[PDB]
UniProtKB/Swiss-Prot annotation, chain A:
The modification N6-acetyllysine is found at residue 175. Its main location: cytoplasm. Non-catalytic component of the 20S core proteasome complex involved in the proteolytic degradation of most intracellular proteins. This complex plays numerous essential roles within the cell by associating with different regulatory particles. Associated with two 19S regulatory particles, forms the 26S proteasome and thus participates in the ATP-dependent degradation of ubiquitinated proteins. The 26S proteasome consists of a 20S proteasome core and two 19S regulatory subunits. The 20S proteasome core is a barrel-shaped complex made of 28 subunits that are arranged in four stacked rings. The two outer rings are each formed by seven alpha subunits, and the two inner rings are formed by seven beta subunits. The proteolytic activity is exerted by three beta-subunits PSMB5, PSMB6 and PSMB7. Interacts with SERPINB2. Interacts with RFPL4A. GO terms for cellular component: cytoplasm; cytosol; extracellular exosome; extracellular region; ficolin-1-rich granule lumen; nucleoplasm; nucleus; proteasome complex. The gene is PSMB1. This is Proteasome subunit beta type-1.
Curated annotation (Swiss-Prot), chain B:
It comes from Homo sapiens. It is linked to Proteasome-associated autoinflammatory syndrome 3: An autoinflammatory disorder characterized by onset in early infancy and recurrent fever, nodular dermatitis, myositis, panniculitis-induced lipodystrophy, lymphadenopathy, and immune dysregulation. Variable accompanying features may include joint contractures, hepatosplenomegaly, anemia, thrombocytopenia, recurrent infections, autoantibodies, and hypergammaglobulinemia. Some patients may have intracranial calcifications. PRAAS3 inheritance is autosomal recessive or digenic. GO terms for molecular function: lipopolysaccharide binding. This is Proteasome subunit beta type-4. GO terms for biological process: negative regulation of inflammatory response to antigenic stimulus; proteasome-mediated ubiquitin-dependent protein catabolic process. The keyword Cytoplasm applies. Induction: Up-regulated in fibrolamellar carcinomas. Belongs to the peptidase T1B family. Its main location: cytoplasm.
Swiss-Prot record, chain F:
Transmembrane segments: none annotated. The gene is PSMA1. GO terms for molecular function: lipopolysaccharide binding. The modification Phosphoserine is found at residues 108, 175. Glycans are attached at residue 108. Belongs to the peptidase T1A family. This is Proteasome subunit alpha type-1. Component of the 20S core proteasome complex involved in the proteolytic degradation of most intracellular proteins. This complex plays numerous essential roles within the cell by associating with different regulatory particles. Associated with two 19S regulatory particles, forms the 26S proteasome and thus participates in the ATP-dependent degradation of ubiquitinated proteins. Gene3D superfamilies: Glutamine Phosphoribosylpyrophosphate, subunit 1, domain 1 (3.60.20.10). GO terms for cellular component: centrosome; cytoplasm; cytosol; extracellular exosome; nucleoplasm; nucleus; proteasome complex; proteasome core complex. Its main location: cytoplasm. The 26S proteasome consists of a 20S proteasome core and two 19S regulatory subunits. The 20S proteasome core is a barrel-shaped complex made of 28 subunits that are arranged in four stacked rings. The two outer rings are each formed by seven alpha subunits, and the two inner rings are formed by seven beta subunits. The proteolytic activity is exerted by three beta-subunits PSMB5, PSMB6 and PSMB7. Interacts with NOTCH3. Interacts with ZFAND1. It comes from the Eukaryota.
UniProtKB/Swiss-Prot annotation, chain H:
Pfam families: Proteasome, Proteasome_A_N. Keywords: Acetylation, Cytoplasm, Glycoprotein, Nucleus, Phosphoprotein, Proteasome. GO terms for cellular component: cilium; cytoplasm; cytosol; extracellular exosome; mitochondrion; myofibril; nuclear matrix; nucleoplasm. The modification Phosphotyrosine is found at residue 154. It comes from the Eukaryota. This is Proteasome subunit alpha type-6. Belongs to the peptidase T1A family. Its main location: cytoplasm. It comes from Homo sapiens (Human). The keyword DNA-binding does not apply. The modification N6-acetyllysine is found at residues 97, 99. It is found in: Cytoplasm; Nucleus.
Length: 212, 213, 245, 73, 198, 237, 235, 241
């Protein structure tokens, strides 16, 4: 009796000067069966933070419910909504709480910090913690994170302008990388959810991907 | 339940436009043996919720007992509040995940059908704790050979009426009995609509064997 | 004071535990709840007292559903009554979970009586300050009605009345052929009895809560429908005028 | 009501609530409650007695004082 | 082992072989599989003897106490429910499958089968034990609704004879018990009273 | 008395239990709070006291899960304990069942929890009265719970010191409720607090708290300058 | 009459009062006075140290202590209960930092300490009587400088200016007279020391007082002898 | 000596347990009376049955309980305590049969109940529940047996006993009737018990205002005699007396 199943999933997060994009494929399989087509993998923890959970779906759901409950408890205790950094630290503690029966779930929090700039944190199942600038996770992260390195970090491209990426360009980057992901990774595809976090709020945008 | 002793088989659920219709064999298999055949693997949780399991029948019976007692307690309260199909789905998901984490799983895969507030609900609580709300569900070994038909029909016509939904579930159970070693030609169809839940007895398929001779 | 009336674990020099008697006194100070066991069912009526016009209708229900087929009519401290209703609900749930069928009312009454006796044994807890009645009906056992009191005695009954007006209620119930009446008429008789025993110049406001469990419900306890309660109330008022005349 | 008959007691007083709050007063103590309510209304330049004046009357009759105790919400 | 129960109007007949192996050696060859739970309810046991006996004794204790407290004869459903609770709870420790058959005033002539696990299914005729399968298929054809007590007795005898004939782990004498209003009548078919080829 | 009111475990020789009555008296040491409800809203309005002109005004409306708020009158320790218990119960219900806990069931849980102390010698009855405002799919609810472990489903109620003025106002004007806009409803609550206020005193933004829940309105607490649109609109005596 | 109603912390009086909580609040007065002032430029704490005799070095009377780098506590009451509650506050602030990776707000830490204090006889916390100590948590958080007062009953509330201890009733009046919102931290220090000199039987000079301040910036700073003398020069 | 009176565990300066004595007074508080007599091959318990209301179900009203298939008891005292102790006796008998494989002897069940009561008399956790249990059964080697289990741990066996208000009068009557041909038959034992109750209460019994339970060697199952049997006994024995 294996208590884990890999449900597949691809999530991506890009920070920025004033925005945070958190996107996820909507496909959700249980092996070689596409099974459900809906149920994206990005949750709106608060109007300034969205968390993308990938991997075992039962653990994704339970961890999301635990995070929401803990956000409510913090709100009642402190009379103020959690900041993105506080959510990241609390989630690190929660993930490490089950260090000897880990949540089989890769987490990427993305949202606005207190100063108002974008911020992306990436966690491993046991509860590691790092404030990256842009990170991919899940199954297609292997073929996604390199292109983000190329086009947001300008890696290996000498003699280039280091213009901060705009929201439109970041969205185009996300959509293109996820098109290539839907093509090359069988798990990825079947609709794409985008959550843009900015001072205005959280904008949800859906893009059709390869149905297979 | 580390080892499933006497298991059911695939359970189907389709989102009728004004309700939900699920289908399930009456066969409780013990390995490669029919054993018990006159057992219903569908439960009427309440006026607007119904359940169908495709795993260890003992575990399904335990869950049926627990759910029935919960609904009885709620009715005893009788304060005008009723468990929604989604509420039953969430409670079932939490119970299954809790026992998974405890490493004492309930070896059941369950379709939850319901019709509340004019909204049809269909969920897929499995053994480990995976929970869904897909338009059509085919749990068990019937996923591979039943979900395709339902998906193609739904994509060609997203909204289904009573007659066509019933015909589609009949054809899917037909294919299941055709090519499922642990199936049986006696299946119940339970339909939940605004008027309540009705389980339509021991229906049978009119199998055509001259097709392949 | 007596000196032996503190703690329910002390026997006075007569064999009397006075805390249980004080609990009985507490129950014999509340509104009146009666219950009559007709041939094909049991009907509970309670003269709930609306202690303020602010409380909405149906507040402080003294008729609980203790299991689907069993109704409970309480009289006394309503907090203790709710706790006992929860205890009886849990006992019925445990019975159905273990043995697999609806709890017999005789057994349910015995279990709850043993619980009440548990709380009257000790000095760390006070005896339950309420009496109650358990009524049910089934094809294989028949209509049954039991009464439990703070001391924990579970005698069966044909007609029972607990609360302020218990003696008068029993007097007015004796003059009934309950053993051969039907639910549809015993409900009206219950309403009439409650209205007669109710005191208007002392209790002021008043609300009649009725319930039956009987053959015409397939052994399922429930609150008497609106129209039936209205007709029984009208008949009770007419009968009050007739008795005055 | 008897001992407040000859006063300017406002119609809004709730003698049922007063009887609930008494808790083992004599009839003499009830009369004193009425008298002290009258005196308290005479204080604070009141043209009518009021239920809160009656409450202060019960307080003075028992000789107790009402203070905003700091550990009460 | 092999155990069977058949329901007839107003009663029920249980039957069981009398073999108890510990491998390929018959530790006991006149074992009494049938066990009287209360007075009319009987349980036919299969699986590990220790677990089955412990469960039967515990259920006898529980049902006796329940019936004495209720002042009423127990229900076959109640006895089978106690068996189901224990078996389901201790699925992983109990290698026991049981058939509870009996008579009660309300639903006389009842047969429930709690196989390995915790199932709870009433049946017109129930079969269990290692040698079940063969007679299981045979009774699928032989059974006909509306049998009387004598026809049910012959049916059970022939079925268990077939199972004993074709099963290495079953063999010995055949113990039958007919339960109804009048009570319980138990008999044994030793060597010749049992069919020869059918 | 004098030997029958030392603990909750002793019945007095009159069928009367004294420490519960003493807790029900403790509920009157709080401050006035009036709850009331239309057909699509529920409003708690509380008169916040002040321990000194420097110290802020003690909060009296607390925020249970989004569809429930609470107004407290009595011991603040017990208020905190019961608020924590209610929050935990609502969270547990929203975790197990993906829906808000019904208010009529939350109040039953509170009743059982508060009744347990009133029968065993290990603690004192919770000396805090509660006005629970909530909005479940049935409709807006106002509940009252008293230290006796008794709860009443009230269409409009008031508790605390100087409560009968507000209760009489509510009895007089409750026929208006139900068919009221939210502003009119809050105005009626503020009028009730005015009635319970001493004549020389008046309702100021400093000492008034207004919690509102209802359809398409998650429980919101208005304090300090948030109550200005209500008090400003309120007519003067 | 308060002989069957104030012998235990879980016995109500006919008026509905916890006389044991009353008595703990009374035990508060036996400590030396402490005045905290909240201002837009920070928060100040100033306490009457009550040296009984020389040979007891001053760093053993801890009336002003540090909770994290952004809160100070001015205490009045039993030293033992003071130590217990101060330790709870410190550990709670560190726990919140560990979990959420940020500084606990003054209100939240006061709430945690009050939550510890509520549990007189609640049989699931083990203390059996109210903590006979009253605290002033003056700190700085994202909401600007704040000062909170907590009492034995567990009740806490913010205070633009407060005084606890023996000279509480007679010093809060002076605080009311002299305090206004648009006050600088130097003005608050001067006014607090003036009130302390008013309410002390001993003369104000160098030792016998402690002064501390938490500002939007530098951490909680306890004035040493030099700063104390500089302020006392022209209080 | 009244100070040594409010606690079950305090010895009076002369070594008395006033709370236990008060439990006995509680026995003498239900108003009812019970008598028990054993013949050669039968035992009989007879209890006064009060049903002071037409609305009270006489079938449910009773003081004769079937502790097990072959053991019966008559309880006198507080009804709640009586039923609690009856449940305890049934549980103990079931445990005995489970553990040891044979039906509990009557004397053993009495010793178990008496020990349970002695525990409460020694420790201070409960009050000694104020009921008296008279048990009857048929022992395979001894014969008919009648026992008492008073609420202090005393459980002597009896040729004939009584409990309740008129226990002393019934005891004197049974002493006189047993000094002369203690050898009684079934009918003679029922006669003796019913006559003892009637004479001590100063009343002649209707068939309903009395409840009789019987065990016999030929039929060793506790049987509660029906109204017809009670009336037959009364009429026939009064006629032929």
């Amino acid at each position: 009796f294996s208590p884990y199943v890999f449900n597949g999933g691809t999530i991506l997060a890009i920070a920025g000067e004033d925005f945070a994009i958190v996107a996820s494929d909507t496909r959700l399989s249980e092996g070689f069966s596409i099974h459900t087509r809906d149920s994206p993998k990005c949750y709106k923890l608060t109007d300034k933070t969205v968390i993308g959970c990938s991997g075992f779906h039962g653990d994704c759901l339970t961890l999301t419910k635990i995070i929401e409950a803990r956000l409510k408890m913090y709100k009642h205790s402190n009379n103020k909504a959690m900041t993105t950094g506080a959510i990241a630290a609390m989630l690190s503690t929660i993930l490490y709480s089950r260090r000897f029966f880990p949540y089989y779930v890769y987490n990427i929090i993305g949202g606005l910090d207190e100063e108002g700039k974008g911020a992306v944190y990436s966690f491993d199942p046991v509860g590691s913690y790092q404030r990256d600038s842009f990170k991919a996770g899940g199954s297609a992260s292997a073929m996604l994170q390199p292109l983000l390195d190329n086009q947001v970090g300008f890696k290996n491209m000498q003699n280039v302008e280091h213009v901060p990426l705009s929201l439109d360009r970041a969205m185009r980057l996300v959509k293109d990388v996820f098109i290539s992901a839907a093509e090359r990774d069988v798990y990825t595809g079947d609709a794409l959810r985008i959550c843009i976090v900015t001072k205005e709020g959280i904008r949800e945008e859906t893009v059709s991907l390869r149905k297979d | 339940t580390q080892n499933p002793m006497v298991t059911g088989t695939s359970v189907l659920g389709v989102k009728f436009e004004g309700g939900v219709v699920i289908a399930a064999d009456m066969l409780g298999s013990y390995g490669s043996l029919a054993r018990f055949r006159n057992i219903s693997r569908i439960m009427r949780v309440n006026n607007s919720t119904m359940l169908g399991a495709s795993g260890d029948y003992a575990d399904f019976q335990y869950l049926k007992q627990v759910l029935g007692q919960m609904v009885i307690d709620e009715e005893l309260l009788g304060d005008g509040h009723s468990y929604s199909p989604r509420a039953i789905h969430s409670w079932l998901t939490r119970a299954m995940y809790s026992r998974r984490s405890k490493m004492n799983p309930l070896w059941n895969t369950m379709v939850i059908g319901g019709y509340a507030d004019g909204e049809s609900f269909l969920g897929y609580v499995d053994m480990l704790g995976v929970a869904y709300e897909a338009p059509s569900l085919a749990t068990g070994y019937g996923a591979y050979l039943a979900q395709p038909l339902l998906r193609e029909v739904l994509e060609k016509q997203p909204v289904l009426s009573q007659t066509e939904a019933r015909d589609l579930v009949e054809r899917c159970m037909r294919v299941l009995y055709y090519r499922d070693a642990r199936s049986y030609n006696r299946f119940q169809i339970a339909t939940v609509t605004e008027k309540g839940v009705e389980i339509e007895g021991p229906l049978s398929t009119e199998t055509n064997w001259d097709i392949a001779h | 004071g007596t000196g032996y009336d503190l703690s329910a674990s002390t026997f006075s020099p007569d064999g009397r535990v006075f805390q249980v008697e004080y609990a009985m006194k507490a129950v014999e100070n509340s509104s009146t709840a009666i219950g009559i066991r007709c041939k094909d069912g049991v009907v509970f009526g309670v003269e709930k007292l609306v202690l303020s016009k602010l409380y909405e209708e149906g507040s402080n229900k003294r008729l609980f559903n203790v299991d689907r087929h069993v109704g409970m009519a309480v009289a006394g401290l309503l907090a203790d009554a709710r706790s006992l209703a929860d205890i009886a609900r849990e006992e019925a749930s445990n019975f159905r979970s273990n043995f697999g069928y609806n709890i017999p009312l005789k057994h349910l009454a015995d279990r709850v009586a043993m619980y009440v006796h548990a709380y009257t044994l000790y000095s760390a807890v006070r005896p339950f300050g309420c009496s109650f009645m358990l009524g049910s009906y089934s094809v294989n056992d028949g209509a049954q009605l039991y009464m439990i009191d703070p001391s924990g005695v579970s005698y069966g009954y044909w007609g029972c009345a607990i609360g302020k007006a218990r003696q008068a209620a029993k007097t007015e119930i004796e003059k009934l052929q309950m053993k051969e009446m039907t639910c549809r008429d015993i409900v009206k008789e219950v309403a009439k009895i409650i209205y007669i025993v109710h005191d208007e110049v002392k209790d002021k406001a008043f609300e009649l809560e009725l319930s039956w469990v009987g053959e015409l419900t397939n052994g399922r306890h429930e609150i008497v429908p609106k129209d039936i309660r209205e007709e029984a109330e009208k008949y009770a008022k007419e009968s009050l005028k007739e008795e005055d005349e | 009501q008897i001992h407040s008959r000859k006063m300017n007691v406002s119609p809004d007083v709730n003698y049922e609530e007063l009887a609930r709050c008494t808790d083992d007063f004599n009839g003499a103590q009830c009369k004193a409650v009425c008298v002290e309510a009258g005196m308290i209304a005479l204080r604070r330049g009141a043209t009518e007695l009021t239920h809160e004046d009656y409450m202060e009357g019960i307080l003075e009759v028992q000789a107790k004082k009402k203070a905003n105790l700091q550990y009460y919400a | 082992t092999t155990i069977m129960a058949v329901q007839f109007d107003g009663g029920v007949v249980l039957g069981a072989d009398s073999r108890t192996t510990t491998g390929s050696y018959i530790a006991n060859r006149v074992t009494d599989k049938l066990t009287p739970i209360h007075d009319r309810i009987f349980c036919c046991r299969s699986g590990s003897a220790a677990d089955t006996q412990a469960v039967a004794d515990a259920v006898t204790y529980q049902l006796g106490f329940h019936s004495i407290e209720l002042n009423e004869p127990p229900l076959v459903h109640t006895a089978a429910s106690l068996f189901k609770e224990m078996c389901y709870r201790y699925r992983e420790d109990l290698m026991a499958g049981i058939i509870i058959a009996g008579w009660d005033p309300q639903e006389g002539g009842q047969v429930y089968s709690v196989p390995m696990g915790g199932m709870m299914v009433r049946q017109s005729f129930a079969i269990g034990g290692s040698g079940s399968s063969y007679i299981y298929g045979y009774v699928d054809a032989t059974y006909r609704e509306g049998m009387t007590k004598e026809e049910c007795l012959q049916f059970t005898a022939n079925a268990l004879a077939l199972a004993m004939e074709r099963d290495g782990s079953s063999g010995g004498v055949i113990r039958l018990a007919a339960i109804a209003e009048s009570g319980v009548e138990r008999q044994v078919l030793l060597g010749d009273q049992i069919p020869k080829f059918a | 008395r004098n030997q029958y009111d030392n603990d909750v475990t002793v019945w007095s020789p009159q069928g009367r239990i004294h420490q519960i009555e003493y807790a029900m008296e403790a509920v009157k040491q709080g401050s006035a709070t009036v709850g009331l409800k239309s057909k699509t809203h529920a409003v708690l309005v509380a008169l916040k006291r002040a321990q000194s002109e420097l110290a802020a005004h003690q909060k009296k409306i607390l925020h249970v899960d989004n569809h429930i708020g609470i107004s407290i009158a009595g011991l603040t320790a017990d208020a905190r304990l019961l608020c924590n218990f209610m929050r935990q119960e609502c969270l547990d219900s929203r975790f197990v069942f993906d829906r808000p806990l019904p208010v009529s069931r939350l109040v039953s849980l509170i009743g059982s929890k508060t009744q347990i102390p009133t029968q065993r010698y290990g603690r004192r009855p919770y000396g805090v009265g509660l006005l629970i405002a909530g909005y479940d799919d049935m409709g807006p609810h106002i509940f009252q719970t008293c230290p006796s472990a008794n709860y009443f489903d009230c269409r409009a109620m008031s508790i605390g010191a100087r409560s009968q003025s507000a209760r009489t106002y509510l009895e007089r004007h409750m026929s208006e409720f139900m068919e009221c806009n939210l502003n009119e409803l809050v105005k009626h609550g503020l009028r009730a607090l005015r009635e319970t206020l001493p004549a020389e005193q008046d309702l100021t933004t400093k000492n008034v708290s207004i919690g509102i829940v209802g359809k398409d309105l998650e429980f919101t607490i208005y304090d300090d300058d948030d109550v200005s649109p209500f008090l400003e609109g309120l007519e003067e005596r | 009459t308060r002989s069957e109603y104030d012998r235990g912390v879980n016995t109500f009086s006919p008026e509905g009062r916890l006389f044991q909580v009353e008595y703990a609040i009374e035990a508060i007065k036996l400590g030396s006075t402490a005045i905290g002032i909240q201002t837009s430029e920070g928060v100040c704490l100033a306490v009457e140290k009550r040296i009984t005799s020389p040979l007891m070095e001053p760093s053993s009377i801890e009336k002003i202590v540090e909770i994290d780098a952004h809160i100070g506590c001015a205490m009045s009451g039993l030293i033992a209960d003071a130590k217990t509650l101060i330790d709870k506050a410190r550990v709670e602030t560190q726990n919140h930092w560990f979990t959420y990776n940020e500084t606990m707000t003054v209100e939240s830490v006061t709430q945690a300490v009050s939550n510890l204090a509520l549990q007189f006889g609640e049989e699931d916390a083990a203390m059996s009587r109210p903590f006979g100590v009253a605290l002033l948590f003056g700190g700085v958080d994202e909401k600007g400088p704040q000062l909170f007062h907590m009492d034995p009953s567990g009740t806490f509330v913010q205070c633009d200016a407060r005084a606890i201890g023996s000279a509480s009733e007679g010093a809060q009046s002076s605080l009311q007279e002299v305090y206004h919102k648009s006050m600088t931290l130097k003005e608050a220090i001067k006014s607090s020391l003036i009130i302390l000199k008013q309410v002390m039987e001993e003369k104000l000079n160098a030792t016998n007082i402690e002064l501390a301040t938490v500002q939007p910036g530098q951490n909680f700073h306890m004035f040493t002898k030099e700063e104390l003398e500089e302020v006392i020069k022209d209080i | 000596s009244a100070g040594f009176d409010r606690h079950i565990t305090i010895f009076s300066p002369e070594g008395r347990l006033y709370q236990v004595e008060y439990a006995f007074k509680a026995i003498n508080q239900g108003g009812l009376t019970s008598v028990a007599v054993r013949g050669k091959d039968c035992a009989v318990i007879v209890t006064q049955k009060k049903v002071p209301d037409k609305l009270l179900d006489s079938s449910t009203v009773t003081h004769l309980f079937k502790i097990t298939e072959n053991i019966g008891c008559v309880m006198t005292g507080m009804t709640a305590d009586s039923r609690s102790q009856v449940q305890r006796a049934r549980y103990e008998a079931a445990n005995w049969k489970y553990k040891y494989g044979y039906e509990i002897p009557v004397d053993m069940l009495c010793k178990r109940i008496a020990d349970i009561s002695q525990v409460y008399t020694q420790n201070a956790e409960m009050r000694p529940l104020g009921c008296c249990m008279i048990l009857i059964g048929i022992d395979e080697e001894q014969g008919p047996q009648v026992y008492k289990c008073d609420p202090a741990g005393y459980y002597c066996g009896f040729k004939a006993t009584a409990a309740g208000v008129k226990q002393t009068e019934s005891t004197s009557f049974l002493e006189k009737k047993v000094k002369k041909k203690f050898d009684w038959t079934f009918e003679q034992t029922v006669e003796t018990a019913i006559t003892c109750l009637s004479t001590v209460l100063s009343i002649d019994f209707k068939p309903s205002e009395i409840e009789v339970g019987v065990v016999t060697v030929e039929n060793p199952k506790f049987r509660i005699l029906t109204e017809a049997e009670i009336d037959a006994h009364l009429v026939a024995l009064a006629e032929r007396d």
